[PDB]
Amino acid sequence: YQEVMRNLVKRYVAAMIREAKTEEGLTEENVKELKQDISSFRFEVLGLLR
Amino acid sequence: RDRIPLRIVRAESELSPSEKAYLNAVEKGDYASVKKSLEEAEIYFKININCIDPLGRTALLIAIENENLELIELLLSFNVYVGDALLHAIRKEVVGAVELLLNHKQFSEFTPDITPIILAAHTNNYEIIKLLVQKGVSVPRPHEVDSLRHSRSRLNIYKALASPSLIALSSEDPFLTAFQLSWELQELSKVENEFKSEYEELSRQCKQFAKDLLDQTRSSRELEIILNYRDDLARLKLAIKYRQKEFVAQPNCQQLLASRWYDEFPGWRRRHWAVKMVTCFIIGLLFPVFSVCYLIAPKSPLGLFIRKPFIKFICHTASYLTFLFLLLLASQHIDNRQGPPPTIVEWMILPWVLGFIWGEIKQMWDGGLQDYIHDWWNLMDFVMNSLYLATISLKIVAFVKYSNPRESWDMWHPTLVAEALFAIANIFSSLRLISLFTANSHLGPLQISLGRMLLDILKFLFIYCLVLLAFANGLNQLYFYYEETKGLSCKGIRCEKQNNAFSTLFETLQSLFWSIFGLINLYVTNVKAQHEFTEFVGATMFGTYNVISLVVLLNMLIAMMNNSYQLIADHADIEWKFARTKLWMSYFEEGGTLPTPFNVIPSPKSIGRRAADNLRRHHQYQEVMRNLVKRYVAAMIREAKTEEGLTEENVKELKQDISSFRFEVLGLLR
Amino acid sequence: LQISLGRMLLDILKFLFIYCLVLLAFANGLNQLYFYYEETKGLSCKGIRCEKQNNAFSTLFETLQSLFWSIFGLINLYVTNVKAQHEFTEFVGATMFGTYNVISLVVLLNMLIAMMNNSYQLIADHADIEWKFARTKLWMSYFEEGGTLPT
Amino acid sequence: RDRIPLRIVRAESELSPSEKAYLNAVEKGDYASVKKSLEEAEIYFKININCIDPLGRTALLIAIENENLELIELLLSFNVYVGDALLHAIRKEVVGAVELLLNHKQFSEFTPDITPIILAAHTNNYEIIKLLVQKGVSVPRPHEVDSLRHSRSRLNIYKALASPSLIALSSEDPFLTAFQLSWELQELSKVENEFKSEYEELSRQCKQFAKDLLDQTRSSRELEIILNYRDDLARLKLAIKYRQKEFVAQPNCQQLLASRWYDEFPGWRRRHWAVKMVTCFIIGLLFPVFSVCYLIAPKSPLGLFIRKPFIKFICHTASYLTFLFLLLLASQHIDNRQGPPPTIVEWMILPWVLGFIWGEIKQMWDGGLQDYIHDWWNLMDFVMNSLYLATISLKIVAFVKYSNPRESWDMWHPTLVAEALFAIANIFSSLRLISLFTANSHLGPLQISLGRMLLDILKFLFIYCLVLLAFANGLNQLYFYYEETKGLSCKGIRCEKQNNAFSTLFETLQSLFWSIFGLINLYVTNVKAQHEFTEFVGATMFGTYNVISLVVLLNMLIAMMNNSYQLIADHADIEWKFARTKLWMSYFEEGGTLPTPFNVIIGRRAADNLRRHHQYQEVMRNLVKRYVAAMIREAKTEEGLTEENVKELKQDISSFRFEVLGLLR
Amino acid sequence: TNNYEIIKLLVQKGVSVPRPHEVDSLRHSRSRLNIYKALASPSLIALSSEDPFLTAFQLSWELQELSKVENEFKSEYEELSRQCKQFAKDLLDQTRSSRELEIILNYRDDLARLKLAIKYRQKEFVA
Ligand SMILES: CCCCCCCCCCCCCCCC(=O)OC[C@H](COP(=O)(O)O)OC(=O)CCCCCCCCCCCCCCC
Ligand SMILES: CCCCCCCCCCCCCCCC(=O)OC[C@H](COP(=O)(O)O)OC(=O)CCCCCCCCCCCCCCC
Ligand SMILES: CCCCCCCCCCCCCCCC(=O)OC[C@H](COP(=O)(O)O)OC(=O)CCCCCCCCCCCCCCC
Ligand SMILES: CC(C)CCC[C@@H](C)[C@H]1CC[C@H]2[C@@H]3CC=C4C[C@@H](OC(=O)CCC(=O)O)CC[C@]4(C)[C@H]3CC[C@]12C
Ligand SMILES: CC(C)CCC[C@@H](C)[C@H]1CC[C@H]2[C@@H]3CC=C4C[C@@H](OC(=O)CCC(=O)O)CC[C@]4(C)[C@H]3CC[C@]12C
Ligand code: NA
Ligand code: NA
Ligand code: NA
Secondary structure: OHHHHHHHHHHHHHHHHHHOOOOOOOOHHHHHHHHHHHHHHHHHHHHHHO | OOEEEOOOOOOOOOOOHHHHHHHHHOOOOOHHHHHHHHHOOOOOOOOOOOOOOOOOOOOOOHHHHOOOHHHHHHHHHOOOOOOOHHHHHHHOOOOOHHHHHHOOOOOOOOOOOOOHHHHHHHOOOHHHHHHHHOOOOOOOOOOOOOOHHHHHHHHHHHHHHOOOOOOOOOOOOHHHHHHHHHHHHHHHHHHOOOOHHHHHHHHHHHHHHHHHHHHOOOOOOHHHHHOOOOOOOHHHHHHHHOOOOOOOOOOHHHHHHHHHHOOOOOOHHHOOHHHHHHHHHHHHHOHHHHHHOOOOOOOOOOOOOOOOHHHHHHHHHHHHHHHHHHHHHHOOOOOOOOOOOOOHHHHHHHHHHHHHHHHHHHHHHOOOOHHHHHOHHHHHHHHHHHHHHHHHHHHHHHHOOOOOOOOOOOOOOHHHHHHHHHHHHHHHHHOHHHHHHHHOOOOHHHHHHHHHHHHHHHOOHHHHHHHHHHHHHHHHHHHHHHOOOOOOOOOOOOOOOOOOOOOOHHHHHHHHHHOOOOOOOHHHHOOOOOOHHHHHHHHHHHHHHHHHHHHHHHHHHHHHHHHHHHHHOOOOOOOHHHHHHHHHHOOOOOOOOOOHHHOOOOOOOOOHHHHHHHHHHHHHHHHHHHHHHHHHHHHHHHHOOOOOOOOHHHHHHHHHHHHHHHHHHHHHHO | OHHHHHHHHHHHHOOHHHHHHHHHHHHHHHHHHHHHHOOOOOOOOOOOOOOOOOOOOOOHHHHHHHHHHOOOOOOOHHHHOOOOOOHHHHHHHHHHHHHHHHHHHHHHHHHHHHHHHHHHHHHOOOOOOOHHHHHHHHHHOOOOOOOOOOO | OOOOOOOOOOOOOOOOHHHHHHHHHOOOOOHHHHHHHHHOOOOOOOOOOOOOOOOOOOOOOHHHHOOOHHHHHHHHHOOOOOOOHHHHHHHOOOOOHHHHHHOOOOOOOOOOOOOHHHHHHHOOOHHHHHHHHOOOOOOOOOOOOOOHHHHHHHHHHHHHHOOOOOOOOOOOOHHHHHHHHHHHHHHHHHHOOOOHHHHHHHHHHHHHHHHHHHHOOOOOOHHHHHOOOOOOOHHHHHHHHOOOOOOOOOOHHHHHHHHHHOOOOOOHHHOOHHHHHHHHHHHHHOHHHHHHOOOOOOOOOOOOOOOOHHHHHHHHHHHHHHHHHHHHHHOOOOOOOOOOOOOHHHHHHHHHHHHHHHHHHHHHHOOOOHHHHHOHHHHHHHHHHHHHHHHHHHHHHHHOOOOOOOOOOOOOOHHHHHHHHHHHHHHHHHOHHHHHHHHOOOOHHHHHHHHHHHHHHHOOHHHHHHHHHHHHHHHHHHHHHHOOOOOOOOOOOOOOOOOOOOOOHHHHHHHHHHOOOOOOOHHHHOOOOOOHHHHHHHHHHHHHHHHHHHHHHHHHHHHHHHHHHHHHOOOOOOOHHHHHHHHHHOOOOOOOOOOHHHOOOOHHHHHHHHHHHHHHHHHHHHHHHHHHHHHHHHOOOOOOOOHHHHHHHHHHHHHHHHHHHHHHO | OOOHHHHHHHHOOOOEEEOOOOOOOHHHHHHHHHHHHHHOOOOOOOOOOOOHHHHHHHHHHHHHHHHHHOOOOHHHHHHHHHHHHHHHHHHHHOOOOOOHHHHHOOOOOOOHHHHHHHHOOOOOOOO
């Protein structure tokens, strides 16, 4: 029974972590991530050319 | 104790920290660090290439989940354990699955029945399905001669075949595939009580796909090629046959059905409604005039004028109406144990009734008895015309072997049974005008919504019949001793005094049934003897019957019809129009057309061309379906964009497209 | 269907307590107004459950029977007469019986209809996952052995 | 003709193409091309700096809409016509408005009443409001001594004051500001039939803000400082006074109200319900025992035991119940034109009735008559106890000046009127047990949902009363000639024969009203004479009355109560709990407490005011701090990205592009 | 927050949760609701439980019968008990290939797990 529950908890956690993606809604803070990933990268490349 | 300890009960190794740095080199987009840490292999201490996280992620799943094709080319350049990372490249609709196709107990996340083309069809992506069909692939057929795999795998096969892209591709015509699949999925959902809401979902998907292929039909004649394709209007007959209620009312199909119903009235559907009432009134008045023609000269203006199917309806219904006015007129006449055929009225009746019987036998020749007994109005015609046969048979049997008491009759004397069955057949005959409502646009959807609440009422009256049997057994059991007064007529109930109400079981059923309404009084539950306890217990039983039947159950029936009528009125006007095209399309065929008395009588008063046409119609229809499948696939792939919802993994794409690019530019400046 | 009705029963039984307080209210009123002016102990039959319906609001128990049967159309208007000639107590007793009929038959009973509409819409969402639970209770009452011998 | 031509009817200049290239140099993020095309000015052929698109866009609005601060610094470095691009930097919640604050008929997009702090409060952004309050700013007061500007500007002022960030900042205590603003916006929505759904929206916003400030209360004693702040439980009395139905049921407030209602039963709310019925039964049975104490010794175990407000309820209601059992027992006794005080039963009654009258006058001393006549059960107590005064007054008047006919009385003889009013007062007295349901958790919300459908029923019975007047005028007008049989009693209706039904108007109203039910038969509409036409027209009038009243109107009343009960049952359990804390909180005060028959028979002030005042302001500093942090956290998780967020990222890639290409080329 | 990865990152270090039972008042009910809100999450039942079906069933029982105790916070403990009642149904949804189902529905510590599931009124586990 613990081996069967190892299988079920394994594929269940994989299933819900798959379903955390398809929520059809992006909070604004996701934009706060991408906007920094362009910004900090900018302040690295301008640190190498200047 | 005081705390509770938390230990990982189900634990793997998990990983080496160098391997954790290798999986941290992916998920960031490092084309440099992954290439170094992969070239450190074949030493090969100590990182294995095929390393697996505590949560899946076999090191090539990360290159797909974070959608990066260069790391897929780098990992497939080496020997990464692929199986089964092709399937993971299908859920995300990555079209890097080309690289998993053209090139190169372990916890599969998928049920092992899943082939690539089944999960390709589940995701409904047209491009990946076309990428697989160009290589293989085969789907197993579902039929047969330990149990979760069988129903699950059968539902994955039917779930894959019902997708509108393996019906767009890989089908001779997608209308037969959508119709027959919707039939097999509906009748398969009836078989398995389990998984009912999933096979109904797939049959609804197939029923919507055909409607959307009709939505892609521009420019009739492209519509008429579809709705005539015999392998008349054969595709609409075959569409009504498979109960495709959304295929009909395309609304492009209702213009073809509507113009063919009106052919060729110049602008009849634009006139004033009272002018429509006058024209339907005077065309309805001239129903012997148009219908003596088509017997004199079927090639004539009037003989071609009754071939108009709107002129068939009014006036089949006008002839039916004069039959009903004549049944009004039957009970206003003359008012003998053996009669004539009485009166002159019934001498006028006999061709109408023989016309309805010939109409029902003639209707059972072409079709039935499954499609005949499917509709309820035809069953009602069987009961009506059967009571007409019983009535005229007991009138003829009454004319023979009888001759004269005024009223002191046998009480089963065949004149009385003939009159009673004749009256019941007049109720069933004059309730047929409710079925004439589906032609009207205002009285139409109303009638069909009531007809769909009837099946939810009939499930409820069975419970009420058990309450009648319950309180009837109680009250009969309590009153068959204390109540039997056989000394004077009248007997009760249907009586001015209401004497013996709960004596027999049949009179008790009548007493409770009429006590639904306020038609049975309280002095009913007295005893002629003096027993106040049995009178009070009988009256309390009658009171709890009135509470359970009139306060509890009848208002539960009201609530049930509220919830049913709210579910029905969503799908009205796409289910009214289906029954309207059944009624319309019952008048398109020829002969057929002679209103009820004139159906049998001379009128009563009282070869390589077959292969050429098959290849011409066949290649013509396949060319039209090439156009429709082309613009339909373009339409749905357009509608996959405007979903107004971005999943989080889209951010997982852009965030890598900035990240990996970063680790390229820093690779060129440093 | 049966289980949705069985789940509306507990919302009905919360409602009949209010109605029982309306019966106690108008029963105390009508008994209090008619125990003087109405007591005819000279002839059987007594009323109610009677062809003449003689003494309806005399005692409290007969008043509860009179109002309860007057939910339905089974108790007539000549019930609220007095053998003596007092038109004011007859009119006040008939107005009390009229407001009883309005509160019970127009106000409360249609509020019970509305209550069962809102309850049956909440119940029918969770039907077929609550029918199947009671079906596996009924199924699983027959899995065990001995047990099995019909009554 | 055959076509229809389409010409721009409303046309500006529009622009020069060089100016179109200048506005195309912005909206792409060009820090180089904008700087060149701005340094080409003061030549100054031919681009003006203040150039305006066909769709607004005064060349600095583009630097805000596409959120770029370097072009705002570049344009504000030169002389761009700013007014009013500060306001456009507030809708988008750009915190580059600092640069429009610290530094530097023309189609304003905004109504000219809009100041920066009003539109700052409309967008509810805490940071921009704090950036403006540090500079000015003042809001006009709304009251007064051509007409769209007045109501629109008043609604913008109230719309700005009702925002939960000019109540978080800029208020002495935000609970009084939320309560008084919710009152002024509700009672202001009643004044103006127009704009009703907007002032109701703002009052709902104020009523939610106070509930969310209670949601930020952790760790009582922080709650009890709030709910005791007298400028008892003064803030809950003031919260019930302003009908803050969501403030109550915080649900943190129901624990404070619930423990104070139970003080101090060890775990009463965990026991079995039948054990609760036994304890309430035997405590309800001993109501003279606990209530003779607090008259003997109010400092005693039993004298402090009736000070428990749950022990006040049961047993005020137990004393009320023995009054009702005794009214059951009144009609089972002895069964004279002049009586005693009859019987011994009423000799027992008089202290209960004088107790209720003293309870209602005592209730009208502390409060009312607005808050007294607001609740309907108190009005019902006024009618009940008034009929008790009329009853005992006609019994005393009956004892004097009378002495003996058995039944042949005056028909307005005061014994009969005393008995009739006594019976009506027993109906109104024993319908009070329905008001005892709000203490119960199962019978509670049901009673209040019915009580909220009553006001929608009473709007409907006015239409029905007009249908009664209509068909009553018709049927009386048709039958006052052909029907008047004054030759034999009984008269009809309330009669075995039902003789004269439509003779007079009052009997016609009785005939139609009883013909709602199946209590009036068809032979009612006959004439003693032989006129079949007037009998058929009278019967058709009675038939259309039965169709309009019993098929049309009564099922419309059913449908009306369906739509009303679906709207009511959403806001149940936050409106049951409000009336439950009214009922609970009617028993918290002292004296007060004696069940119905037994009711009659200095610098330290400045130190306590500064201590309570600074303590409460410290607690409100904590709550406003963590509340503003909470709502600014909830501004993120909205699950919806507007398109203009894409207009930000797309510029952050674009302008960066036009910087890197400026360094490699 | 129900994130499986961060919970596994913490369980590898400590951590302990206090037990809820007992022998000024907002902290007690709030902290008890945070403890039951943490134990009812489907990732501290996925990790850190002997079998998650008994933990989901017994937690759904204690949260339902705990929502009956406290009239306040009723709609939050009912929400958590509904969360536990859904977690068990989703673990049955992850069962492929009976015999994997019959091992679950027979585990006596007949069909003992269905009798124990009907006993705890798990109406969604069944069906
Ligand atoms: C059981 C399957 C069907 C569905 C389940 C039904 C739920 C259970 C039904 C409850 C039983 C009915 C009550 C008992 C009948 C009865 O008392 O009838 C028995 C008698 C009625 O008069 P008799 O005694 O003269 O017969 O009760 C009395 O003696 C008079 C006092 C009782 C007053 C009844 C109060 C109950 C309220 C019912 C009316 C509600 C009206 C709604 C409008 C506001
Ligand atoms: C109180 C807790 C329960 C819920 C609260 C109930 C709300 C209050 C109920 C209002 C009181 C009832 C009205 C008074 C009864 C009465 O008049 O009854 C008293 C008498 C009735 O005839 P008698 O006088 O002969 O008794 O009124 C009359 O004299 C005749 C003229 C009155 C016409 C009544 C008009 C009121 C409309 C009620 C019928 C609505 C039918 C709905 C279908 C369209
Ligand atoms: C007007 C403001 C109020 C709201 C508006 C009301 C809408 C208009 C009402 C329509 C008028 C009522 C119909 C006329 C009454 C009448 O005919 O009553 C008049 C008589 C009734 O019998 P008498 O003739 O003996 O009086 O009609 C007849 O002669 C018998 C044949 C007529 C059959 C009536 C058919 C109408 C259907 C009404 C019953 C519906 C039952 C619903 C359950 C299925
Ligand atoms: C028993 C005798 C006394 C007849 C009494 C009934 C008739 C007066 C009514 C009842 C139903 C009515 C019918 C209801 C519906 C229709 C369909 C309707 O036909 C249409 O809507 C035309 C089609 C279109 O509108 O495109 C009008 C005729 C008809 C037969 C109506 C004709 C008159 C009918 C038979
Ligand atoms: C069933 C018919 C015959 C009516 C019976 C009349 C009385 C015996 C009933 C009518 C209303 C009942 C009351 C309805 C509501 C309440 C509130 C309820 O009090 C509580 O719920 C305690 C508060 C809490 O539970 O926290 C129980 C007592 C009481 C007065 C009940 C006491 C018994 C009463 C008076
Ligand atoms: Na037929
Ligand atoms: Na009736
Ligand atoms: Na009071």
